[PDB]
Amino acid sequence: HMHSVVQSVTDRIIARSKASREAYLAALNDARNHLLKQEVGSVAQVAGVPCDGVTQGQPGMELSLLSREVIAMATAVGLSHNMFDGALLLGICDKIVPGLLIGALSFGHLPMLFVPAGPGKVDRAQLLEAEAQSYHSAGTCTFYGQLMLEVMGLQLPGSSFVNPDDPLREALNKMAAKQVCRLTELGTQYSPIGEVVNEKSIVNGIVALLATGGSTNLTMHIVAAARAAGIIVNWDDFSELSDAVPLLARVYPNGHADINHFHAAGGMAFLIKELLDAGLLHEDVNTVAGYGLRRYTQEPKLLDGELRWVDGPTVSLDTEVLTSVATPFQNNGGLKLLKGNLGRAVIKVSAVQPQHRVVEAPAVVIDDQNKLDALFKSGALDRDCVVVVKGQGPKANGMPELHKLTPLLGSLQDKGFKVALMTDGRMSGASGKVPAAIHLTPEAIDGGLIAKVQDGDLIRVDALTGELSLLVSDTELATRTATEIDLRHSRYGMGRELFGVLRSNLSSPETGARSTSAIDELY
User: Fold this and answer.
1) Residue 154 near residue 195, CB atoms below 8 Å
2) What is the bridge-based pairing of β-strands 335-340 and 419-423?
3) Lesser CB count within 10 Å: N end or C end of the chain?
4) What angle do CA 81, 84, 88 make, to 5 degrees?
5) In Å, what is the CA distance from 261 to each residue of 145, 373, 438?
6) In a 3-state reduction of DSSP, which class is residue 389?
7) Interrupted backbone of the chain, residues before each interruption (C–N > 2.5 Å)
8) Where are the alpha helices (DSSP H) in 159-216?
9) Which domains occur in the chain, in start order?
């Protein structure tokens, strides 16, 4: 009983991935026929024998996306010893996990499980893990101030929210080990990761990303992970799914409540039940815990020393943090595609007031986010304008998160000016109140129309119709020469010398910003 939009988009993805997915699974068959994590992420391998961390400096931030590719390759090297009947993956989040996932799908014939570490007066959370206290008591004390792997059934149900030092966490580490052995090709329950990752589970990951108000960074990683598995997903999928997926959670970047507060309110077991009930998640999937996604509506407990899974909550205890689909924060995910002569981008409109969703204003062009403050201080932005930030894509400088953009433009909007952002890069990944067209493609150095934009040019960002237009004629654009962007300082320093070949081959954000190839593209 699936929602018509989710069923439609799923079918579209299946159709579009037909050949690539068939080739991936054929290759997989050929392959058959043959605690403190300040950064210790590793790949443990089964039948038990035991990888690169994070990178978010200042110029080190220009290696963050690139480190996913490095993690993927490093995973492949570890697994290339080929004496494993299955594997275990020990990874944090955001930059790590997608990299591991990508690398793991190269060995898609093996069963695998992700083993999370988890997220003070730690007394209460332990009492809850062990029956001693109810959800009521956990909720109230967190009130006094990896989700993708959950919906995709790539780790044990409710395993990511157990505190690291907890004896339940110890039990869940033991169960993870035993379970992979049961998922081996030997028989009974053969569940290879390249099969657990499929069109339905990918779609499931997207809707959960949308229902939780997750980072726009994960849009690239979901697409990169899926591509590795022969599954082709684009921005039309995200934008059209968003229209059907309600917003159900307010987690820190959007509000004050942290992940533990989210969990105490009801958590993934509640969210997944709601989406299942609404026909927003595919139930008919194989997971690392067995068949059927309804297994992920259950929560682990350590009762009398015995690890048990019990029924999760059916009501939210805190409707300011977590909500039901009947009465959501918003009846959609706020992720929209923008198209026009400028190309293709995405926008989060979730925190953008309807009055601010359409901006038509003269352009203000910079090729470095640091140039913005001097322009702001000279009063050059104290008017309606679209601030264009170019040379910020994957190929230009490794696509660093741009944190210096939203605050000033927000204050410009607050003063009553009509303002918008347009970049071939990205911000923190969070949702702002200022309309921002992000991940613009083709990027400036790829010859995208953004490179020809001049100060004064009218740019229309219309999040209502999905239009992104530079209001100059094709003929006037033929006369223009794009200004040369000086990238010399983005090419060396902080180890950047090492990544020129990878950075230069990064694909478009919509194609996952990959430097790697999928099995099927060479099969």
Assistant:
1) no
2) unpaired
3) N
4) 105
5) 9, 36, 30
6) strand
7) 34, 37, 47, 50, 119, 145
8) 167-182, 193-196, 199-211
9) 1-115+176-245+486-523 (no CATH), 116-174+246-333 (no CATH), 334-485 (3.50.30.80)
